[PDB]
C-alpha cells in the first residue's frame, strides 16, 4: 500500500514558507522605511543648521550697521568741536558724545584720535549669501511597498 | 465511507487565506504611514520656506534702515556746508561725506542734488508680517494600527 502521508506533508510546508517569505520581506520593508526617514530628518536638520547661520550672519550685518552709524555720528560731533562751531566744553555736546560712545557696540574699534573703524564681521561673501536667499530644503519622498501574496503548494497531478 | 480528505484541504486554505488578509492590510498599513509622513515632511519644509522668507524680509528691514540713517547724516552734513558753518573745502568734512556715501548701500537712490531717497523694499505689509510673529508650523500626527487576528477553520460539527 502506497502511503499518501507525504503528499499532504508537501502542502503545509509551502504555506509556512511563503508566509515566512512575506514576513522577511515586510521586516526589510520596515527597515527600508526607517533608514530613509532618518536621512530625511537629518537633511531637514541640516537645513535648520543653514537657516540659523544666516540669522547669525544677519545679526553681524546689524552690528556692522550700528558701527557704521554711531562712529559717523561721533565723527561729525567731534568735527563740530574741531572747527570751533560748538564749544568743546559744551556740556550737551559732551553728553551726546558719551551717549554715542556707550552705544558703539562690539564691532566698533577705536583706531586713534577720536576715530572708530567698523571691523565688518559680515564680509562681502556674508552679504552676498544673505542677499542671495538661495535656501532650499529640497524635496522629500518615501517608498511604497508592493503587495505580497502567500502561495499554496500546487498539488502536482502525477498523470 | 465518507472522504474526510476534503475537510482538511478546506481547513488549511482558510489558515492561508486569513493570513493573507493580515498581510495585505499590513502592507497597506505600511503605505498608510509612508504617504502620510511625506505630507508631514513637505509640510515641515513649507514651514522652513516661510522662515527663510521672513529672514529675507527682515534683511530688507535692515537695508532700508541703512538708507534711512546715512543719507540723513549726509543731509545734515551737507546742510552744514550749505549754511556756511564749516568750509566746503574742509577736508575732514569732505572725507566724512565720501565715507557716508560709500556706506549708503543699494537701497538708497540718488534723487539728484546731493540728496538720496530710501526706496523701501520692505513695504508696510512686510513690516506688518514681521511684527505679527504669527508663524506656526502646526501639529503633526500619525495613525495607530490595531492588531490583526488570524482564524483557524471552525470544524463544522455536522449535528
Amino acid at each position, epitope marked *: 500500500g502506497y502511503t499518501s502521508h507525504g503528499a499532504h506533508g508537501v502542502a503545509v510546508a509551502a504555506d509556512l514558507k511563503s508566509t515566512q517569505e512575506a514576513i522577511n520581506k515586510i521586516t526589510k520593508n520596515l527597515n527600508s522605511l526607517s533608514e530613509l526617514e532618518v536621512k530625511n530628518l537629518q537633511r531637514l536638520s541640516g537645513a535648520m543648521d543653514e537657516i540659523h547661520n544666516e540669522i547669525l550672519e544677519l545679526d553681524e550685518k546689524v552690528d556692522d550697521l550700528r558701527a557704521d552709524t554711531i562712529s559717523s555720528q561721533i565723527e561729525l560731533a567731534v568735527l563740530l568741536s574741531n572747527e570751533g562751531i560748538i564749544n568743546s566744553e559744551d556740556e550737551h555736546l559732551l553728553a551726546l558724545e558719551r551717549k554715542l560712545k556707550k552705544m558703539l557696540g562690539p564691532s566698533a574699534v577705536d583706531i586713534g*584720535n577720536g576715530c572708530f573703524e567698523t571691523k565688518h564681521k559680515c564680509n562681502q561673501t556674508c552679504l552676498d549669501r544673505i542677499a542671495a536667499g538661495t535656501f532650499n530644503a529640497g524635496e522629500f519622498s518615501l517608498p511604497t511597498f508592493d503587495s505580497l501574496n502567500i502561495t499554496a503548494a500546487s498539488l502536482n497531478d502525477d498523470g | 465511507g465518507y472522504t474526510s480528505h476534503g475537510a482538511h484541504g478546506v481547513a488549511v486554505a482558510a489558515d492561508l487565506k486569513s493570513t493573507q488578509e493580515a498581510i495585505n492590510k499590513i502592507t497597506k498599513n505600511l503605505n498608510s504611514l509612508s504617504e502620510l509622513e511625506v505630507k508631514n515632511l513637505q509640510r515641515l519644509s513649507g514651514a522652513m520656506d516661510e522662515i527663510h522668507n521672513e529672514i529675507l524680509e527682515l534683511d530688507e528691514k535692515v537695508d532700508d534702515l541703512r538708507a534711512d540713517t546715512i543719507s540723513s547724516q549726509i543731509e545734515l552734513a551737507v546742510l552744514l556746508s550749505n549754511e556756511g558753518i564749516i568750509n566746503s573745502e574742509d577736508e575732514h568734512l569732505l572725507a566724512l561725506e565720501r565715507k557716508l556715501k560709500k556706506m549708503l548701500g543699494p537701497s538708497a537712490v540718488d534723487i539728484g542734488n546731493g540728496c538720496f531717497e530710501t526706496k523701501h523694499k520692505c513695504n508696510q505689509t512686510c513690516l506688518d508680517r514681521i511684527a505679527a510673529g504669527t508663524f506656526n508650523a502646526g501639529e503633526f500626527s500619525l495613525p495607530t494600527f490595531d492588531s490583526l487576528n488570524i482564524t483557524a477553520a471552525s470544524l463544522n460539527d455536522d449535528g
Partner: antibody, heavy 119, light 110 residues
Framework: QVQLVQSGAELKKPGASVKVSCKAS????????IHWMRQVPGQGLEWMGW????????HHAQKFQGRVDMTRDTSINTAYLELTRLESDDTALYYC????????????WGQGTLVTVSS | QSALTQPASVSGSPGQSITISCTGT?????????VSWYQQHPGKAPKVMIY???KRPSGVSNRFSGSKSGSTASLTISGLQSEDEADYYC??????????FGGGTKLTLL
C-alpha cells in the same frame, strides 16, 4: 609752539610705582590723543597705549594690562602715565606723543623721561 | 603681538639713494593705510618723517619718500647726507586700537 614737556627722570626700587607727566602746549589739549611709548637704551621703541584727553578713554597694550594707568588734568593740559609693580625690564626712556585726527602722525614727541628700576 | 620686521642696519655712501623696508601682516600694514616712518638720533627723541604711507610733514626734506605695497612699507632716501645717519622705525596700526613699532634699522654712512 606745539610742544610736549615730560617730567624729569625717576628711579624706583622693584615693585614700586612711578608716575610720568607730559604737559601739552601750543595746541588744543583735547584735539588729539596722547600716546605713550617706551624704549630701552640701545633698543627699539615699544608702544604702550593711548589716552583720549577729551573723554579720558584709554587703550593699553595687552602686555601692559593691569600695570599701567593713564589719566589727565585738562586744566593744566597735562597727561599722566602711572606704572605700578615696577621691574628691571621697565628701565627705559618713556615718551608721550600727540596723535592727530585720522593720522598715523605722532607729532611732536616729548623729550623723554628716563625711568630706572634697580635695587 | 609681532613686531614689524625691519632690517637691522643699512649702509650707503653720501649722495646715494637707499631704501629701508618694513614687512608685516595684512591686518596691520596691508589692511590699513596708517604706516609711519620716524627718525631718531642719539640722545634725541624720535622725529616723524613720513605718515599715512606717503605724507610728508612740513619741514621734512623732499628726499624722504614713503611707499606701501601689500603688507610691506618702504622708505626711500635719495641723495644720502651726513644728517641721515640715524635709527629709523616703522610704526603701524595693528587693529583693535593697537599700534606696533618695527624692530628698527640703523642707517650708517661709509
Amino acid at each position: 609752539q606745539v610742544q610736549l614737556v615730560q617730567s624729569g627722570a625717576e628711579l624706583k626700587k622693584p615693585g614700586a610705582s612711578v608716575k610720568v607727566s607730559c604737559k601739552a602746549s601750543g595746541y588744543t589739549f583735547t584735539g588729539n590723543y596722547i600716546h605713550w611709548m617706551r624704549q630701552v637704551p640701545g633698543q627699539g621703541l615699544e608702544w604702550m597705549g593711548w589716552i583720549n584727553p577729551r573723554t579720558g578713554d584709554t587703550h593699553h597694550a595687552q602686555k601692559f594690562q593691569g600695570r599701567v594707568d593713564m589719566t589727565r588734568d585738562t586744566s593744566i593740559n597735562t597727561a599722566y602715565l602711572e606704572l605700578t609693580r615696577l621691574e628691571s625690564d621697565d628701565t627705559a626712556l618713556y615718551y608721550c606723543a600727540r596723535c592727530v585726527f585720522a593720522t598715523s602722525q605722532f607729532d611732536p614727541w616729548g623729550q623723554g623721561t628716563l625711568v630706572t628700576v634697580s635695587s | 603681538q609681532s613686531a614689524l620686521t625691519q632690517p637691522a642696519s643699512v649702509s650707503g655712501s653720501p649722495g646715494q639713494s637707499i631704501t629701508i623696508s618694513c614687512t608685516g601682516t595684512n591686518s596691520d600694514i596691508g589692511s590699513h593705510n596708517l604706516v609711519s616712518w620716524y627718525q631718531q638720533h642719539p640722545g634725541k627723541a624720535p622725529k616723524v618723517m613720513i605718515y599715512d604711507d606717503s605724507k610728508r610733514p612740513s619741514g621734512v626734506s623732499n628726499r624722504f619718500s614713503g611707499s606701501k605695497s601689500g603688507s610691506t612699507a618702504s622708505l626711500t632716501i635719495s641723495g644720502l647726507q651726513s644728517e641721515d645717519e640715524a635709527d629709523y622705525y616703522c610704526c603701524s596700526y595693528a587693529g583693535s586700537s593697537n599700534w606696533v613699532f618695527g624692530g628698527g634699522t640703523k642707517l650708517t654712512l661709509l
